[PDB]
């Protein structure tokens, strides 16, 4: 299985296979580039999640942001209500997941931060 | 305004357990890190730990790592560090912070207590 | 990891201004933001400095950071000396689990 997300670290992972990358060793200091996933499917069975090498801002997936700075619950977000939380760790590699299974009410949208030294790559998920 | 108020701290003999706290006022608590910095009488700034928003991530230096352990309660705003096998070495005042992670810096500080390990 | 390495103490007159360093021994200086601590005889810790040279509210402009990247080193400046200003300094910077402290520097506003 896939994770819809975002791998922002260089370590070559097994356990994990993710849609998107964008090594976070390669932007500006005290700036941002985004990583984007869309989802737009009828009923889901999906894991979302990234692979920080840094921090993870804010702590994702249970919170998520709306420079972003508004910070949500994502049960309150996405508004459905059973959704697992998941978590790995490959050293200094942070993984955080969510599994979401089912119908959305609302298209919703929500971004959460990796962030290693002055460098911060952002991750927006869209899900209709 | 924003506020961290230290609880009680004491003398301990080698090997003993202790408890800090720090009631927190004045901001979101769920919404910030926070952190454990120490200072041992004449010394320098020391980093003993630090715990994310809800706990997603946390942080110890090795000199502590197994001994003490940094936890919250967003339901009481109160952050707390548990101390076991308490060594002299541990002799120091214990400072609450809050930090900006996003900054990397602790932009509010508690008024200390000092622990004291001696037999 | 790395170390932050500070003068043991520094001092001048009222009026006057005053340095303090941080040298980073390993990485470079320029990769993670330096914060600056200013401690008051038994008082806590007050920021004075973040994100290499931003003030938070609360401290005049007579506080100011830089980075000198071919050193590997930050600074602390201070003019404008007035009493109050007597203090231990601290340099502070992190890497990814990692908090660290410059040794401290006593500034004394000689009277």
């Known amino acids: 299985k896939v994770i819809h997300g975002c791998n922002f670290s260089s370590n070559v992972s097994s356990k994990h296979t993710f849609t998107d990358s964008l090594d976070i060793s390669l932007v500006d200091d005290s700036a941002h580039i985004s990583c984007n996933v869309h989802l737009s499917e009828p009923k889901y069975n999906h894991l979302v999640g990234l692979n920080c090498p840094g921090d993870i801002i804010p702590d994702c997936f249970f919170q998520v942001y709306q420079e972003p700075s508004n910070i949500v619950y994502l049960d309150s977000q996405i508004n459905i209500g059973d959704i697992e939380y998941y978590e790995d760790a490959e050293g200094d590699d942070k993984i955080k997941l969510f599994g979401i299974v089912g119908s959305i009410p609302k298209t919703t949208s929500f971004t959460c931060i990796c962030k290693k030294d002055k460098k911060s790559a952002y991750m927006t998920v869209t899900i209709d | 305004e924003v506020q961290l108020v230290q609880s009680g701290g004491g003398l301990v003999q080698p090997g003993g357990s202790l408890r800090l706290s720090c009631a927190a006022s004045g901001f979101t608590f769920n919404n910030y890190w926070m952190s454990w910095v120490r200072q041992a009488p004449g010394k320098g700034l020391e980093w003993v730990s630090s715990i994310s928003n809800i706990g997603g991530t946390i942080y110890y230096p090795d000199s502590v790592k197994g001994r003490f352990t940094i936890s919250r309660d967003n339901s009481k705003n109160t952050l707390y560090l548990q101390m076991n096998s308490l060594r002299a070495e541990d002799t120091a005042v214990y400072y609450c912070?809050?930090?900006?992670?996003?900054?990397?810096?602790?932009?509010?500080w508690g008024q200390g207590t000092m622990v004291t390990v001696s037999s | 990891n790395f170390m932050l390495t500070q003068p043991h103490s520094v001092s001048e007159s009222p009026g006057k201004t005053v340095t303090i360093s941080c040298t980073r021994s390993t990485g470079n200086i320029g990769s993670n933001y330096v914060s600056w601590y200013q401690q008051r005889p038994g008082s806590s810790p007050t920021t004075v400095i973040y994100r290499d040279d931003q003030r938070p509210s609360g401290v005049p402009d007579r506080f100011s950071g830089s980075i000198d990247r071919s050193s590997n080193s930050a600074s602390l400046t201070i003019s404008g000396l007035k009493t109050e200003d007597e203090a231990d300094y601290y340099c502070h910077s992190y890497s990814t689990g990692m908090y660290i402290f410059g040794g401290g520097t006593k500034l004394t506003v000689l009277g």
């Open positions: 912070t809050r930090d900006l992670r996003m900054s990397d810096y602790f932009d509010y």
